[PDB]
Amino acid sequence: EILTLDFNLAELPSAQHRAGLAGLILMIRELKKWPWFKIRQKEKDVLLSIENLDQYGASIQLNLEGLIALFDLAYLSFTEERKSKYFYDVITPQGGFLAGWDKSDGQIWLRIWRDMFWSIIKGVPATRNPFNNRCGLNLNAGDSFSKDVESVW
């Protein structure tokens, strides 16, 4: 189906509420700049359109497939191997649009952001339950997850 949402910045009580709006706008724009997103739109009829973009208000329209694609991009994770200084691997999220803008030497700035994300915001195992299962998937292979999307939808 089609689901439409509208939001205003004059009623949000927390700054993080306002920050999330810009974050999701950037995520949608990053989706709009990926060929595989257009391939998904052509095949599964993915709907994700920003209607109103002004100083105060915001509007969005999306379907189930668009939400699934957004979740796949945002919650993409991979596996990294670490050696003590007897081997151990650590699951690390991809980072979303951060990889698309980080051109620094070795993406060391990305490393700091990834460490904080797993370490504090995601200290609860909940990131790991969601993050580890998601990890290692291939977008080009059509891999997707929708068990959690149904509850959110």
Place this chain on the structure above:
DNA sequence: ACACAAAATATCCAGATTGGGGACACGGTGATAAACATGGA
């Protein structure tokens, strides 16, 4: 027992010299613990 008078001018230091030589710490350590919050069937 009466009265009168009770000091005046010159001068009050000159030279040479006021420290020198050596040294201003050595080692060992610079806290240790206990006091949780969210998920799926």
